[PDB]
Coordinates of C-alpha atoms and ligand atoms in Angstrom, one line a residue:
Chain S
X1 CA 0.0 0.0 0.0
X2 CA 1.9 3.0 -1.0
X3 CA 1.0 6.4 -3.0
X4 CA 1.6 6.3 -6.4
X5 CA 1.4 7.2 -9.8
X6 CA 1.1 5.2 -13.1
X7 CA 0.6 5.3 -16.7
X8 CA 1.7 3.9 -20.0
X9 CA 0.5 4.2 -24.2
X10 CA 1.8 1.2 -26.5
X11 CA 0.8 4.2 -29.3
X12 CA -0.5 7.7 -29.2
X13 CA -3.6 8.1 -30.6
X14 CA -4.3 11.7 -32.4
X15 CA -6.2 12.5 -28.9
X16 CA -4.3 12.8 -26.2
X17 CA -5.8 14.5 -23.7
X18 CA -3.2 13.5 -20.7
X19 CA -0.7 15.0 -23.0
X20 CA 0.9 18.4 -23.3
X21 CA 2.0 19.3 -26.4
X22 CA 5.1 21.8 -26.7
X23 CA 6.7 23.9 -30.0
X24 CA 6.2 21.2 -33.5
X25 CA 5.6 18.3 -31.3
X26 CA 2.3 16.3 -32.9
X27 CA 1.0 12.5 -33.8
X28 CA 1.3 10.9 -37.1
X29 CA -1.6 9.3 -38.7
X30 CA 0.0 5.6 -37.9
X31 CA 0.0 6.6 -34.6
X32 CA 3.7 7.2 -33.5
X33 CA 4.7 10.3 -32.1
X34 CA 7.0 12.9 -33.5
X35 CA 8.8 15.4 -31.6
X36 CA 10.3 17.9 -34.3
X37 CA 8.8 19.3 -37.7
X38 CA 8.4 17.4 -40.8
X39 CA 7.7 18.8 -44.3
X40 CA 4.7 18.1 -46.4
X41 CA 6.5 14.6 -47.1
X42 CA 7.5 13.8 -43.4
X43 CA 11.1 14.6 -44.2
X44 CA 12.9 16.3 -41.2
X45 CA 13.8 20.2 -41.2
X46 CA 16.4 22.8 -39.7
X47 CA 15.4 24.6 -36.8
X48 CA 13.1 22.6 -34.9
X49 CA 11.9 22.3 -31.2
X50 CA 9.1 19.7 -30.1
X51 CA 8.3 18.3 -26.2
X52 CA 5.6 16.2 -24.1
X53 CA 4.9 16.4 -20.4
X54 CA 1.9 13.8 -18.9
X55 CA -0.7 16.9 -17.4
X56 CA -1.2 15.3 -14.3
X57 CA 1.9 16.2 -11.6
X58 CA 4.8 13.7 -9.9
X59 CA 5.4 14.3 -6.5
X60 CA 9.1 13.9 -5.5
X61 CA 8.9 13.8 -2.1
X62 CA 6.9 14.6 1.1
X63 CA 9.2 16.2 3.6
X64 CA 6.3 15.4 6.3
X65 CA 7.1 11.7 6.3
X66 CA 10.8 11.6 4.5
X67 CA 8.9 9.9 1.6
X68 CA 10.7 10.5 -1.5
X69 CA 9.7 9.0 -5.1
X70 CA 10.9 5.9 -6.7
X71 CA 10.8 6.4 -10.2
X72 CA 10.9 4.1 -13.4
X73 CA 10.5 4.7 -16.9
X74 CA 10.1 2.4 -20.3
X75 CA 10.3 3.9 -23.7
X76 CA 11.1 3.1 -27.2
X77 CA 12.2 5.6 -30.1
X78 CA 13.9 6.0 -33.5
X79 CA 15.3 8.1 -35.5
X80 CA 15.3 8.9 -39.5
X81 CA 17.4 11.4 -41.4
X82 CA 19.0 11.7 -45.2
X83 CA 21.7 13.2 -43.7
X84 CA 25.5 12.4 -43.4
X85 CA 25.9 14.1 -40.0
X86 CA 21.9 13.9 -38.1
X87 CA 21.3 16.2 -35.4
X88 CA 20.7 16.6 -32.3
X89 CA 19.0 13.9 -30.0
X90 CA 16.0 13.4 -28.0
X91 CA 15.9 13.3 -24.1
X92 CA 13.5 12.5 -21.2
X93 CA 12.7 15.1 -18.9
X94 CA 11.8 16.1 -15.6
X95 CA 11.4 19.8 -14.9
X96 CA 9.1 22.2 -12.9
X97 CA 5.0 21.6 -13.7
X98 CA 5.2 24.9 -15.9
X99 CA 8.8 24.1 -17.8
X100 CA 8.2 25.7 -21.5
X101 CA 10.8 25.8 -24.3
X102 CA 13.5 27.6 -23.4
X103 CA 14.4 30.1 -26.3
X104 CA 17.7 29.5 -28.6
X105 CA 17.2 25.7 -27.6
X106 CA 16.5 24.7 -31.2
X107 CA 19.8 22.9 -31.7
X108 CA 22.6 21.1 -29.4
X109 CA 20.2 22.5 -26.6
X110 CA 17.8 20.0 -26.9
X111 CA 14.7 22.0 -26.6
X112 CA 16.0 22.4 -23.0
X113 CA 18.5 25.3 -22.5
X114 CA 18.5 29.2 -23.4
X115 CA 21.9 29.5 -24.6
X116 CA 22.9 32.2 -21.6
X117 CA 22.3 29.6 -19.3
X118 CA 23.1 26.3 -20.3
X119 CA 26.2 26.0 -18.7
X120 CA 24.8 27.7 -15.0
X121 CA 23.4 25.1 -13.1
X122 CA 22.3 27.8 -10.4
X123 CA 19.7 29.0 -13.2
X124 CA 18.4 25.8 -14.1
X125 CA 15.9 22.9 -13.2
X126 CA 15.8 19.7 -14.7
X127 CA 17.0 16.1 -14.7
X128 CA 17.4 14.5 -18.5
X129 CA 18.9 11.6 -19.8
X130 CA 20.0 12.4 -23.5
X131 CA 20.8 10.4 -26.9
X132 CA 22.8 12.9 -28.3
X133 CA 23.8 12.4 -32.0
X134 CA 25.6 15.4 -33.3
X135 CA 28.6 16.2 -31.0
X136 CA 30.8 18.4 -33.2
X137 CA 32.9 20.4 -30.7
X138 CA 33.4 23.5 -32.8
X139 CA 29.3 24.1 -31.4
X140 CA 28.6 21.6 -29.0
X141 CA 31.5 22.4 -26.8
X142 CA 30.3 20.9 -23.8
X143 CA 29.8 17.8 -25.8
X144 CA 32.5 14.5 -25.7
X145 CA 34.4 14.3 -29.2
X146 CA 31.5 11.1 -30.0
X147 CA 27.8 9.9 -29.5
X148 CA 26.5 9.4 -26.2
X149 CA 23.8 9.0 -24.0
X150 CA 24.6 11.4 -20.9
X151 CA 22.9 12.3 -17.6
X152 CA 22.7 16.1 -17.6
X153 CA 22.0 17.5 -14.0
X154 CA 20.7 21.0 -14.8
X155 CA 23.3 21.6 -17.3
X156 CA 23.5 20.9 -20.9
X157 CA 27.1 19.3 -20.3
X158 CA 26.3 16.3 -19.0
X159 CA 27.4 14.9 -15.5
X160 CA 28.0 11.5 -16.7
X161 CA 28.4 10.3 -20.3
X162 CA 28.7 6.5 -22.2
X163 CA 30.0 5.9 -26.0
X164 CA 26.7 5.3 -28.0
X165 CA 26.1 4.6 -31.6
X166 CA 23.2 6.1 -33.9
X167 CA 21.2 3.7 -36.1
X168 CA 19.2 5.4 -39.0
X169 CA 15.8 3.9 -38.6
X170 CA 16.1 1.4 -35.4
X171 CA 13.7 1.6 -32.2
X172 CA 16.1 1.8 -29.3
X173 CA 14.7 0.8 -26.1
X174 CA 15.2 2.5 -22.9
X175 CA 14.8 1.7 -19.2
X176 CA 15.5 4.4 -16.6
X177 CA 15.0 4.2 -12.9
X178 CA 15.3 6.3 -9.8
X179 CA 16.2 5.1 -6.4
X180 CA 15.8 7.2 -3.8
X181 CA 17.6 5.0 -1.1
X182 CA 20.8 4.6 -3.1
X183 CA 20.3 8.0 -5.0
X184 CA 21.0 6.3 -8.2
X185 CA 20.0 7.1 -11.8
X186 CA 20.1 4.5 -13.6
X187 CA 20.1 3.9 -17.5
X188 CA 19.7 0.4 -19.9
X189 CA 19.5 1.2 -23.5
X190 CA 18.8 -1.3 -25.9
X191 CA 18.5 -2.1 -30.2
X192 CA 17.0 -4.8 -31.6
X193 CA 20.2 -7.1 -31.5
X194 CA 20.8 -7.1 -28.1
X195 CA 23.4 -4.6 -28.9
X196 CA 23.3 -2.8 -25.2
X197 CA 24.3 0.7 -23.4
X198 CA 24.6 1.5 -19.2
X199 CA 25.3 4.3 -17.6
X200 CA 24.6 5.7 -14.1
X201 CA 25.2 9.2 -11.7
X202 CA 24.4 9.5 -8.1
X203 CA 22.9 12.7 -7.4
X204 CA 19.6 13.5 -4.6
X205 CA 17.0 14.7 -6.9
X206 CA 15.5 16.2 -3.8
X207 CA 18.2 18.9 -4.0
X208 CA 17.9 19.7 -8.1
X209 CA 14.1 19.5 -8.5
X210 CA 11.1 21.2 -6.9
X211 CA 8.3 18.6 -5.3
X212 CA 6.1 18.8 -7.5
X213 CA 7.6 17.9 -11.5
X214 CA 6.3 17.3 -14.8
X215 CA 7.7 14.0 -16.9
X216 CA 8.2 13.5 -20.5
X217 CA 10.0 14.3 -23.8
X218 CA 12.2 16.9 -25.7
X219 CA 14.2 16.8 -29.2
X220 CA 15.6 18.9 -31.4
X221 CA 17.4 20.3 -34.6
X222 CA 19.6 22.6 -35.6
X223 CA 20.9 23.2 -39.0
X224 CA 21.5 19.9 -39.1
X225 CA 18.5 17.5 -39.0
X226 CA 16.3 14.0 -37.9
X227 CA 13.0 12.9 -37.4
X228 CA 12.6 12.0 -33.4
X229 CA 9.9 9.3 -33.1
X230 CA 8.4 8.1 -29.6
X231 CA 6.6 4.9 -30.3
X232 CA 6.0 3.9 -26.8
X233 CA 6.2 5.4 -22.6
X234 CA 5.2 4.1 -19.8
X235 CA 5.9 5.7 -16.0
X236 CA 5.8 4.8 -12.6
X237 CA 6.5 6.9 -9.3
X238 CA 6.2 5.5 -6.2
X239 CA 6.7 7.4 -2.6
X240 CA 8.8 5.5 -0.5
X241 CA 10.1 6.0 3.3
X242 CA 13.7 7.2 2.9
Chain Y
X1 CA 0.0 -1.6 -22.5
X2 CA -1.9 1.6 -22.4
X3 CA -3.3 1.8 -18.4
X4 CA -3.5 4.6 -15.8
X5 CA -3.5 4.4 -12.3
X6 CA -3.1 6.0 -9.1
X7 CA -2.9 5.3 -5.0
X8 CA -3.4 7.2 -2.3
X9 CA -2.8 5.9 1.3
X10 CA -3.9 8.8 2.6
X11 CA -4.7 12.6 1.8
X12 CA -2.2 15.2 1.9
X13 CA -3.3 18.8 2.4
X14 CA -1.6 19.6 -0.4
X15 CA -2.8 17.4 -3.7
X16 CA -2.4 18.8 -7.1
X17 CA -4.1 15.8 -8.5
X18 CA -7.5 15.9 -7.2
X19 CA -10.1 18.1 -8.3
X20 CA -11.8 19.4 -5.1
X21 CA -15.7 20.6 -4.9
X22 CA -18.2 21.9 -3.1
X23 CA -17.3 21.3 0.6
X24 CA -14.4 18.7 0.3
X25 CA -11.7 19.2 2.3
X26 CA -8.6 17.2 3.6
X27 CA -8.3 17.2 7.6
X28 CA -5.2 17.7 9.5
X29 CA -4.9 14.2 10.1
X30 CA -4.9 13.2 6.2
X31 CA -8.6 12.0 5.8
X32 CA -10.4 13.5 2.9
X33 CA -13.7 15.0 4.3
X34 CA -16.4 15.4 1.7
X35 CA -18.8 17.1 3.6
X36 CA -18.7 19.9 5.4
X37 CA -18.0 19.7 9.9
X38 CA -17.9 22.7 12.5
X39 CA -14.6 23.9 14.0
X40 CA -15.5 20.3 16.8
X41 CA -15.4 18.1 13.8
X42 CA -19.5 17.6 14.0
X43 CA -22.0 17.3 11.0
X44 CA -23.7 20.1 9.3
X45 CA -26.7 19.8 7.4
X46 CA -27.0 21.0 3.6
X47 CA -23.6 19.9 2.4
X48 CA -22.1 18.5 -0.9
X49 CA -18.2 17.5 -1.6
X50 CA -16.8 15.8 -4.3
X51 CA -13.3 14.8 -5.7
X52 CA -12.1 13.7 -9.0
X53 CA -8.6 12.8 -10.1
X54 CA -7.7 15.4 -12.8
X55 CA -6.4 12.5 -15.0
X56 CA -9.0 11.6 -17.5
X57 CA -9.9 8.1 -18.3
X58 CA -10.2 6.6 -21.6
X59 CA -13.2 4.1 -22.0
X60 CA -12.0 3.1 -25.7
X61 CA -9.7 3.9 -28.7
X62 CA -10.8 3.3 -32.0
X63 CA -7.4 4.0 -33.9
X64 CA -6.1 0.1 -31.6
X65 CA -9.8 -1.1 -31.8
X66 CA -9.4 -1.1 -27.4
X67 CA -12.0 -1.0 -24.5
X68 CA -11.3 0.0 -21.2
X69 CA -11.7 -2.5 -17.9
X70 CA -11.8 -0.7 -14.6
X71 CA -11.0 -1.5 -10.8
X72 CA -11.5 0.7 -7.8
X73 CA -10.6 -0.3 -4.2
X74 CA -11.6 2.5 -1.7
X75 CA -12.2 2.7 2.5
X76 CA -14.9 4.9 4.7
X77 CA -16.0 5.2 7.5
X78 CA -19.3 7.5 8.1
X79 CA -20.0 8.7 11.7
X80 CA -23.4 10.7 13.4
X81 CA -25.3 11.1 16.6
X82 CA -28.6 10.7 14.5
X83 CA -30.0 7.2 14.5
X84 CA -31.7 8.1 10.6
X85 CA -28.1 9.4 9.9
X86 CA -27.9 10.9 5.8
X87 CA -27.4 10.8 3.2
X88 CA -24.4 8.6 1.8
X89 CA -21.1 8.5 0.0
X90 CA -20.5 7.3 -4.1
X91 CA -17.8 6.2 -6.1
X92 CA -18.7 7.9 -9.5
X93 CA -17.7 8.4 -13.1
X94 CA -19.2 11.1 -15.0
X95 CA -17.9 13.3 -18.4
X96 CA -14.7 15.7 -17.4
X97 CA -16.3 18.8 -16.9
X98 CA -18.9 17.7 -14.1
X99 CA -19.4 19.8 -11.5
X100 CA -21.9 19.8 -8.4
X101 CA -25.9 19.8 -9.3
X102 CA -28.3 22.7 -8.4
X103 CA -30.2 20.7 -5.2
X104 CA -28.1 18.1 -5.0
X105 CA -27.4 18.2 -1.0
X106 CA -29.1 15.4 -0.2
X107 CA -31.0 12.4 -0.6
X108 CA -29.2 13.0 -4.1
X109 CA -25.9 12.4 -3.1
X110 CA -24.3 15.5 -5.4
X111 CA -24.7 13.3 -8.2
X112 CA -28.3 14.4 -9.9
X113 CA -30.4 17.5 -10.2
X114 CA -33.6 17.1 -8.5
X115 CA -35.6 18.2 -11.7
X116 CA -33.6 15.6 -14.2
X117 CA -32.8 13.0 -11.1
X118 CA -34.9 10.5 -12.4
X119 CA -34.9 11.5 -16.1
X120 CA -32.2 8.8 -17.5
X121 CA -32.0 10.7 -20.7
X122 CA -30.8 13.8 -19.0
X123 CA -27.8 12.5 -17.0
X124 CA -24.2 10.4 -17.6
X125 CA -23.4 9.1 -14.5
X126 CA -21.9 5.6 -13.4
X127 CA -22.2 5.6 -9.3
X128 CA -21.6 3.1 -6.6
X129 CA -23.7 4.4 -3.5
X130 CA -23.8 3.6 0.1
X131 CA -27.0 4.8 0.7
X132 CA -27.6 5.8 4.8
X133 CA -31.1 7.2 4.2
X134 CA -34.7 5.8 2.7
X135 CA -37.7 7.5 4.1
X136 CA -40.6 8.2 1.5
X137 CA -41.6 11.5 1.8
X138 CA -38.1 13.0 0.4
X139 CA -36.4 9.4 -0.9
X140 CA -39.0 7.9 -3.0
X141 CA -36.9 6.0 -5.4
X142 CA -35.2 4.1 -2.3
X143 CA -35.8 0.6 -1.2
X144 CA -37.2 0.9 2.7
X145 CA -33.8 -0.2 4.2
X146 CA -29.9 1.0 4.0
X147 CA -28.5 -0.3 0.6
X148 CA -25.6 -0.4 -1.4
X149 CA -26.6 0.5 -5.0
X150 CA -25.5 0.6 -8.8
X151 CA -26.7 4.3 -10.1
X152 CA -26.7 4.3 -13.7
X153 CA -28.0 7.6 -15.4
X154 CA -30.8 7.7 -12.1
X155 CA -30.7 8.1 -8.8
X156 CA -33.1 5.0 -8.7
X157 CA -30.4 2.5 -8.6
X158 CA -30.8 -0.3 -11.7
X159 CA -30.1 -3.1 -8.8
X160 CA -29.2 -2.8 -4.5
X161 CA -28.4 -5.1 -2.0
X162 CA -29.4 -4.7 1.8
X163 CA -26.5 -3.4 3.7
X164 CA -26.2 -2.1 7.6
X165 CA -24.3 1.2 8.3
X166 CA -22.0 0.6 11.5
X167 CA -21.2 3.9 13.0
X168 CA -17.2 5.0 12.9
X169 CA -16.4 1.5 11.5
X170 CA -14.4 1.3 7.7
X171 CA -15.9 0.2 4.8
X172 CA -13.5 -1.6 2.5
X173 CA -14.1 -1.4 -1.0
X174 CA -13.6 -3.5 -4.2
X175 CA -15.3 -1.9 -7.6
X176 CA -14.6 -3.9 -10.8
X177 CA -15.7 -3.3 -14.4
X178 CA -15.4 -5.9 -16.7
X179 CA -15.7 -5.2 -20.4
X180 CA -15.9 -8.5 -21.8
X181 CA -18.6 -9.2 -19.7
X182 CA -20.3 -5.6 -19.8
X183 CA -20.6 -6.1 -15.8
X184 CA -19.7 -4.0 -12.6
X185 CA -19.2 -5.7 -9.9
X186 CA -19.2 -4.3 -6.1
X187 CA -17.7 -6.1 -3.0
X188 CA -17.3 -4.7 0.5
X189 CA -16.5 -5.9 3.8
X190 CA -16.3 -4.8 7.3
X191 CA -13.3 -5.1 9.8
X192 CA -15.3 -8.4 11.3
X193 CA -15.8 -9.7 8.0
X194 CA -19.3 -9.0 7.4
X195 CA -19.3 -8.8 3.1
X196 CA -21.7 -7.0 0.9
X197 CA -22.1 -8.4 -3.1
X198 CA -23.7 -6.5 -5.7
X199 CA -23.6 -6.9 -9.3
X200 CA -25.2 -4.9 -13.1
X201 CA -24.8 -5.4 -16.3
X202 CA -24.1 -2.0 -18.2
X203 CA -22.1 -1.5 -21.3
X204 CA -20.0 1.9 -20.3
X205 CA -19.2 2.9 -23.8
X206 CA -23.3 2.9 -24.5
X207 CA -23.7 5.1 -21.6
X208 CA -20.3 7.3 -21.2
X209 CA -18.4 9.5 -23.4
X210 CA -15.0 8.3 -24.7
X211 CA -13.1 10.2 -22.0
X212 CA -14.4 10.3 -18.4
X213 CA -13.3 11.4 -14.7
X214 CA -13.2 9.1 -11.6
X215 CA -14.0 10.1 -8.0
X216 CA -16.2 10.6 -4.9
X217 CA -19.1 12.3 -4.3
X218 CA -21.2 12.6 -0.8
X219 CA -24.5 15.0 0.6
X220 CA -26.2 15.7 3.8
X221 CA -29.7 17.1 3.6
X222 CA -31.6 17.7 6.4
X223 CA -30.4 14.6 8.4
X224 CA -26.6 14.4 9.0
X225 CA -23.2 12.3 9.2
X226 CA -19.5 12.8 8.3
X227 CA -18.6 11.1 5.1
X228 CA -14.6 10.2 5.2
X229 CA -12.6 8.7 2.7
X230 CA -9.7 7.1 4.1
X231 CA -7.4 5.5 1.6
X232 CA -8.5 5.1 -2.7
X233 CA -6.3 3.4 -5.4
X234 CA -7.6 3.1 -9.2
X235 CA -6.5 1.2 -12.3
X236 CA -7.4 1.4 -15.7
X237 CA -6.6 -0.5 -18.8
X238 CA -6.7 -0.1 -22.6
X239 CA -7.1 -4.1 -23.6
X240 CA -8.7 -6.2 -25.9
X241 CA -12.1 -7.9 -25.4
Ligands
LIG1 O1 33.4 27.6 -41.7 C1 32.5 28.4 -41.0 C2 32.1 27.7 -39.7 O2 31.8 26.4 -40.0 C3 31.4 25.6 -38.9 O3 30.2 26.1 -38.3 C4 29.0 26.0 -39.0 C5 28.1 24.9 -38.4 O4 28.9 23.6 -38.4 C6 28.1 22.5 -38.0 O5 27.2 22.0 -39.0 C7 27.2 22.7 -36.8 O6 27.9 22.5 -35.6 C8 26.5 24.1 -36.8 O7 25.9 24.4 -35.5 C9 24.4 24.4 -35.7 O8 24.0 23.1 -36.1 C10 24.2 22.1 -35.1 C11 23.6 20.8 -35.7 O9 22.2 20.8 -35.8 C12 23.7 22.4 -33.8 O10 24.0 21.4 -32.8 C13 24.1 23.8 -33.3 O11 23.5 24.0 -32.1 C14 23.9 24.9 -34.3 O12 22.5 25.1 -34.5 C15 27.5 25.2 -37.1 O13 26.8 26.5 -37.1 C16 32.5 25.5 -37.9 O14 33.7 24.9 -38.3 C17 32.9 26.9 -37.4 O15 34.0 26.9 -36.6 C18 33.3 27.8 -38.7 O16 33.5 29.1 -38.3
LIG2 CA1 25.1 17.6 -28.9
LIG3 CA1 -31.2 7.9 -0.1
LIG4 MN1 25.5 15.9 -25.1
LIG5 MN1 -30.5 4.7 -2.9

């Protein structure tokens, strides 16, 4: 018996009404969601900023009785491109109930940063875990010299980074939990093949995050370009004594 | 799969996931009263409170060919000096955007209008009552005895079972909807073990539109009692018949 929070879509249907819908984000017509602009083919554009958040609110802890959330999170995406060098990555996201895109953020920002703060943890709030594609130093600074998939602690250069590789067209699967005893984030990535990715950072989300946060979804592109397809989320949170 | 669901093991004074109205209110000791009490935590009469989780529930989805099942588990205790002690507490579902009927505190349980109450055409309204209160004059719908009923689109319920009300004690219950089988079922026992059973057969996607919200609603008319929800989880899920 515990206080909790739970929901899941195996497809997102054109009405979504638990769903917030941020900058280009929308549903295709075969029911996968897409994140960043398309043309009047589908093809991906320059320039582009799209996000989700779940409407109803996660509660992080409850000072009252040192409950803090246990958190857990399944999703699948891919990502399409014609390009030689596709940019820039999708996250999930945790952020204040009202988080809206920042501006300057279409590009190695995510659709997370304003580019006068990325860097300033002080001026930020969020928690994302990243799949970063497009890396090239000369404007992703911050960035390792490769793909990744990063844990970025209200920064935009990310805490903790692993070596990752892009695949044009294949659903990756992801698994990330919080545990509040160990004050572990924890991240499983996996293709189709078995082919697999971990990382993890230790950091108390009690001291980065408000106690109340929104959950979900940001990606974006610069000048250079990808589709960013969700095809599948589910979420728990669970308060727990700590 | 596609599902929601939500616990609570208690009520917090702060919830940003409930929708509050009328005269519901969460006590200092983390029981969610949904009618109104004086500053010694007594009964008034002429009171209506309701919750609903803010989440909406989908019944179906056309674009995966899905229908939704349902389970509910909720406790409540009721307390009153009154021996005719009214009027009763409901689990409900009803469209997003309901709110709190004109007339309604009372033998109507903030669920029905009393104009349209009986007038199935006029309302969309799944309700579960625990019903304290029967007399004639006011109640004529009621069986002549405290009941557990199935409300669907009336506050005459389509079927009830005889059930005693046991001052202070909690009221554990189970609520199941089962879409294959177009059925609700109800089940609730007492802290001795004394169970209630209850059972309808109603279609909810004949009845309901495709998105609905989930909660509570309870009334006191003239006669009087506390109506205290002490603990309410909920699951929902997206499946195929
Ligand atoms: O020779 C001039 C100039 O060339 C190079 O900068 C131009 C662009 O190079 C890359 O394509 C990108 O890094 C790009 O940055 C935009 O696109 C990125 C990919 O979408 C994105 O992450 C960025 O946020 C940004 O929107 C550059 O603009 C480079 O060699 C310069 O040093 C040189 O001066
Ligand atoms: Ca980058
Ligand atoms: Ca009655
Ligand atoms: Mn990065
Ligand atoms: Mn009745």
């Amino acid at each position: 018996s515990t206080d909790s929070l739970s929901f899941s879509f195996i497809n997102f249907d054109r009405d979504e009404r638990n769903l917030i819908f941020q900058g280009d984000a929308h549903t295709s017509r075969n029911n996968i969601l897409q994140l960043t602009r398309t043309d009047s083919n589908g093809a991906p554009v320059r320039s582009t900023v799209g996000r989700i958040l779940h409407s109803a609110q996660v509660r992080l802890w409850e000072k009252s009785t040192n409950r803090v959330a246990n958190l857990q999170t399944q999703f699948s995406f891919f990502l399409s491109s014609p390009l030689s060098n596709p940019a820039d990555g999708i996250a999930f996201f945790i952020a204040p109930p009202d988080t809206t895109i920042p501006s300057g953020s279409a590009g190695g920002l995510l659709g997370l940063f304003n580019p006068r703060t990325a860097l300033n943890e002080s001026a930020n709030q969020v928690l994302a875990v990243e799949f970063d594609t497009f890396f090239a130093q000369n404007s992703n600074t911050w960035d390792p010299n490769y793909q990744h998939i990063g844990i970025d602690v209200n920064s935009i250069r990310s805490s903790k980074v692993v070596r990752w590789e892009r695949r044009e067209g294949k659903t990756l699967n992801v698994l990330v939990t919080y545990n509040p005893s160990t004050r572990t984030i924890d991240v499983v990535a996996t293709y189709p093949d078995g082919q697999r990715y971990q990382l993890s950072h230790v950091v108390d989300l009690t001291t980065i995050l408000p106690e109340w946060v929104r959950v979900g979804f940001s990606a974006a592109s610069g000048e250079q370009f990808q589709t960013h397809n969700l095809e599948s989320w589910s979420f728990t949170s669970t308060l727990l004594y700590t």
